[PDB]
């Protein structure tokens, strides 16, 4: 069966782990344990196709930035996550996109931009701002809440549908 190598990236605390765990294990992690690098695998059916999602949950802590080249080389598609209540995390997306672009030597890497924590009312990144950024990258923008599950499957499954247009 087809295997898809997804990599979840973004600044510390944006909810990369919560999103991945919600998708794979169907619960919300409330506590905050910073990630080094974890792997998850799951067989799912997406648009009639049985496939294997291999998901890499990466570090947002900048201390671990040296590990990025390795996982950007291997990954097929990237979920670029910021939090809608964290402007700096949105500004941090460009550094991720730029390094992906370098490592892949491509302006056409499968990616989805994800605005997470949409359940929180302390929004500092408006949907339109993020839509604009995604448009410049040629990729979709989707908002999610790992807490309520809103948009979680949509985000990861869309990343799969992007890998498929390539
Ligand atoms: N209200 C709300 N909280 C969230 C959401 N997603 C994650 N969180 C919370 O934000 C904190 C950090 O989440 P976490 O998934 O560990 O973030 P991370 O991006 O994986 N952090 P790191 O880069 O250090 O590994 C946790 O307390 C978690 O419960 C969300 O959609 N809504
Ligand atoms: Ca919990
Ligand atoms: Ca692009
Ligand atoms: Mg994490
Ligand atoms: Mg503003």
XYZ file of C-alpha atoms and ligand atoms in Angstrom:
202
model
C 0.000 0.000 0.000
C 1.022 3.617 -0.498
C 2.985 5.144 2.379
C 2.979 8.917 2.954
C 5.789 10.567 4.898
C 4.311 13.550 6.727
C 6.358 15.921 8.874
C 4.781 18.334 11.338
C 6.832 21.513 11.896
C 6.446 24.859 13.633
C 7.438 26.940 16.666
C 7.452 25.578 20.199
C 4.072 25.158 21.801
C 1.895 25.672 18.725
C 0.295 22.246 19.198
C 2.219 19.985 16.804
C 2.114 17.074 19.237
C -1.485 17.709 20.285
C -2.552 17.693 16.624
C -0.696 14.486 15.783
C -1.895 12.712 18.916
C -5.496 13.831 18.322
C -5.298 12.429 14.777
C -3.670 9.128 15.673
C -4.961 8.429 19.204
C -8.155 10.481 19.441
C -7.491 12.356 22.664
C -6.270 15.844 23.571
C -2.961 16.212 25.384
C -3.512 19.093 27.870
C -0.020 19.144 29.349
C 3.004 20.646 27.629
C 5.968 18.275 27.226
C 8.390 19.698 24.653
C 9.210 17.241 21.885
C 12.622 16.204 20.622
C 11.475 13.997 17.742
C 8.743 11.334 17.773
C 7.289 9.063 15.101
C 3.709 7.815 14.631
C 2.322 5.395 12.076
C -1.241 4.523 11.181
C -3.134 2.775 8.413
C -6.098 4.816 7.185
C -8.410 4.931 4.178
C -8.301 8.257 2.375
C -10.499 8.713 -0.705
C -10.982 4.962 -1.184
C -7.287 4.259 -0.849
C -5.824 2.242 1.978
C -2.592 3.934 2.946
C 0.045 4.223 5.614
C 0.656 7.561 7.272
C 4.127 7.870 8.693
C 4.132 11.060 10.765
C 7.158 12.788 12.221
C 6.423 15.066 15.164
C 9.341 17.506 15.356
C 10.835 19.986 17.849
C 9.685 23.593 18.019
C 12.425 24.470 20.490
C 15.075 26.340 18.516
C 17.778 24.509 20.476
C 17.080 21.496 18.202
C 17.164 23.332 14.848
C 20.202 21.331 13.683
C 17.896 18.310 13.338
C 15.783 20.012 10.662
C 17.934 19.242 7.634
C 17.682 15.512 8.280
C 13.896 15.423 8.539
C 13.359 17.868 5.676
C 15.437 15.610 3.437
C 13.264 12.568 4.243
C 9.771 14.063 4.467
C 7.392 14.097 1.507
C 4.889 16.629 2.827
C 4.986 19.242 5.573
C 2.289 20.447 7.939
C 3.473 23.942 8.802
C 1.758 24.833 12.067
C 1.438 28.139 13.896
C -1.000 29.129 16.666
C -3.626 31.798 15.951
C -2.959 33.314 19.390
C 0.806 33.553 18.831
C 1.899 36.139 16.278
C 5.567 35.230 16.595
C 4.742 31.602 15.716
C 3.102 32.829 12.498
C 6.166 34.958 11.710
C 8.316 31.860 12.387
C 6.670 29.905 9.523
C 8.825 31.586 6.869
C 12.068 30.142 8.336
C 10.548 26.660 8.077
C 9.288 27.163 4.512
C 12.607 28.646 3.400
C 14.639 25.750 4.776
C 12.269 23.215 3.270
C 12.629 25.013 -0.071
C 16.432 24.861 0.147
C 16.683 21.220 1.224
C 14.178 20.041 -1.373
C 15.665 22.397 -3.964
C 12.048 23.003 -4.917
C 9.490 25.774 -4.940
C 6.789 23.111 -5.158
C 7.012 21.006 -2.003
C 3.737 19.508 -0.727
C 2.733 21.602 2.286
C -0.329 22.802 4.198
C -0.345 25.893 6.422
C -2.196 25.246 9.677
C -3.528 27.853 12.073
C -4.036 25.874 15.265
C -5.841 26.631 18.574
C -8.889 28.131 16.826
C -10.879 27.314 19.965
C -9.095 30.168 21.780
C -10.496 33.682 21.604
C -7.167 35.496 22.048
C -6.597 35.660 18.282
C -3.747 37.822 16.973
C -3.443 36.199 13.524
C -6.511 36.821 11.367
C -7.585 34.149 8.893
C -7.018 36.534 5.958
C -3.369 37.128 6.946
C -2.716 33.397 6.912
C -4.676 32.863 3.708
C -2.351 35.432 2.085
C 0.791 33.681 3.278
C -0.459 30.287 2.058
C -1.412 31.776 -1.297
C 2.162 33.051 -1.769
C 3.444 29.522 -1.114
C 0.875 27.960 -3.447
C -0.607 25.883 -0.621
C -3.873 25.554 1.324
C -4.610 27.183 4.691
C -6.691 25.290 7.238
C -7.530 26.194 10.840
C -7.606 23.518 13.505
C -8.167 22.871 17.166
C -6.352 19.864 18.623
C -8.578 20.420 21.656
C -12.002 20.139 19.969
C -10.745 18.113 16.972
C -11.980 20.817 14.573
C -10.149 20.539 11.247
C -7.652 17.959 12.492
C -8.382 15.178 9.999
C -8.953 17.812 7.310
C -5.437 19.216 7.787
C -3.566 15.908 7.640
C -5.763 14.451 4.877
C -5.392 17.623 2.822
C -1.605 17.249 3.156
C -2.035 13.785 1.633
C -4.138 15.205 -1.226
C -1.346 17.742 -1.834
C 1.341 15.065 -1.963
C -0.908 13.463 -4.624
C -1.048 16.509 -6.905
C 2.728 16.330 -7.101
N -6.703 25.508 23.717
C -5.805 24.729 22.886
N -4.617 24.324 23.375
C -3.790 23.613 22.607
C -4.141 23.284 21.303
N -3.130 22.561 20.768
C -2.170 22.441 21.704
N -2.589 23.074 22.816
C -1.857 23.190 24.076
O -0.685 23.939 23.906
C 0.393 23.326 24.694
C 1.420 22.855 23.788
O 1.022 21.821 22.862
P 2.030 20.868 22.184
O 1.231 19.935 21.277
O 2.903 20.149 23.231
O 2.900 21.838 21.286
P 4.145 21.463 20.398
O 4.036 22.338 19.160
O 4.136 19.971 20.069
N 5.420 21.899 21.364
P 7.053 21.518 21.026
O 7.477 22.244 19.749
O 7.962 21.966 22.254
O 7.189 19.936 20.894
C -0.258 22.217 25.455
O -0.611 22.649 26.724
C -1.469 21.871 24.671
O -2.527 21.308 25.409
C -5.380 23.729 20.834
O -5.806 23.443 19.539
N -6.176 24.430 21.640
Ca -6.076 14.937 28.104
Ca 5.434 26.304 -3.059
Mg 5.632 18.634 20.614
Mg -3.201 42.559 13.498
